[PDB]
Amino acid sequence: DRTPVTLIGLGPMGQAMTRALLAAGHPVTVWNRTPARAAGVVADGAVLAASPVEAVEAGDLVILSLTDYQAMYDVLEPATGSLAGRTVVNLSSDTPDRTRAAADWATEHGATFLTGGVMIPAPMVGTEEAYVYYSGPAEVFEKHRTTLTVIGAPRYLGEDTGLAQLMYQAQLDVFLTTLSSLMHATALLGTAGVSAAESMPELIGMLRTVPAMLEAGGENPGADIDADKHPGDLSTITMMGATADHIVGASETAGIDLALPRAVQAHYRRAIENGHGGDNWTRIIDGIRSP
């Protein structure tokens, strides 16, 4: 497939995707707010369009890799007259509802729309470890699937344009929160003179074990939460809530951020007040669903 592709947005992801697409034999026309930044991919075979209009008109497939969806409007507003008959694939972070409204804005300018959420950093783009979530019209996904597969294995979730965005925001909810916690833990160990080079491999060593730990003793949290099975036999909210109290205390004494640990503390405290101290930690999901 040598389908001509347009890609707008040349951050690390944009550049990595351009390169994978070029290497697969697709002519790629790029445009960036900062044209200088295109020099790299242009040396690798990308064609730099002078204008958004020219970039849009070069391909039936327009990929956006921008910081947010406001950026899509900013870049495409001058080109709205040239959208008809093309597919917009937006690979950018934003709210699910912004995304759904953006899909309708594409349709009304005569374009089809697909949502994508890329699940790996730029060096892993186009490798066997790469994967991307997609939602939107099935026929649109199918028409371009072979081209999109170059960036990463697609995981089509269905027709709601909001859905692959919600999945992305859910995944990044885990990922960013985990990262903030790693920095929080590092900070805490830092106050007793432990360096980050010592602390971070300890913390990562533990995180690597987390899938196994969650499965020990034949727990299966998903089905359990669906079934409303929260049995406390191997760990209770009381016992885990206490630890959450201990982390807040240690953090207070360490002079570091209290908001992250107090949020966690509040999940346990809520479940206890609601009378489920004796349940497994999965029960905190009830309080989370109903503030």
Site string for ligand NAP, 10-39 (x = CB under 6 A): xxxxx-----------------xxx--x--
134 neighbors 154 (Cβ within 8 angstroms): yes
Phi-psi region of 25 (alpha: psi -120 to 50; beta: other; left: phi over 0): left
CA–CA distance, 162 with 145 (Å, rounded to integer): 19
Integer-rounded Cα radius of gyration of the chain: 23
Binding-site member from 51, 67, 191, 253 for ligand NAP (CB under 6 A): 67
Backbone torsions φ then ψ of 56, nearest 5 degrees: -60, -40
Q: Tell me which stretch binds ligand NAP (CB under 6 A): 3-11, 153-161, 181-189, 273-281.
A: 3-11
Distance CA 282, CA 271 (A): 10
Contact status, residue 175 vs residue 117, Cβ threshold 8 Å:
no
Phi/psi of residue 167, each to 5°? -60, -45
Does position 189 bind a copy of itself by CB under 8 A?
yes
Q: How far is the CB of 195 from ligand NAP (least distance, A)?
A: 25
Q: Which of 44, 34, 43, 45 is nearest to 10 (CA)?
A: 34
Of the pair 6, 32, the CB lying nearest ligand NAP is at 32
Give which of ligand A1JDG, a copy of itself, ligand NAP, none residue 75 binds (C-beta under 5 to 8 Å, depending on kind). ligand NAP
Which listed range, 90-98, 193-201, 221-229, 275-283, lies at the site for ligand NAP (CB under 6 A)? Answer: 90-98
Site for ligand A1JDG in 131-160 (CB under 6 A): none
Q: Reduce the DSSP state of residue 30 to 3 states and report it.
A: strand
Considering the rule CB under 6 A, would residue 265 count as an interface residue with ligand NAP?
A: no
Q: How far is the CB of 12 from ligand NAP (least distance, A)?
A: 4
What is the residue whose two structure tokens read 């908001």? 259
- Of 42, 48, 140, 203, the residue at the interface with a copy of itself (CB under 8 A) is 203
Q: Which stretch binds a copy of itself (CB under 8 A): 20-28, 53-61, 83-91, 165-173?
A: 165-173
- Least distance from a copy of itself to the Cβ atom of residue 274, Å: 14
168 vs 120: CA distance, rounded Å: 11
CA quadruple 23, 24, 27, 33: dihedral, nearest 10? -60
Q: Is 119 in the site for ligand A1JDG (CB under 6 A)?
A: yes
Kindly state the tokens that stand for 190.
């830092």
The residues that touch ligand NAP, with contacts defined as CB under 6 A, are 9-14, 32-34, 37, 65-67, 70-71, 74-75, 91-93, 118, 121-122, 234-236, 239, 243
The residues that touch ligand A1JDG, with contacts defined as CB under 6 A, are 119-121, 175, 213-214, 219, 235, 240, 281
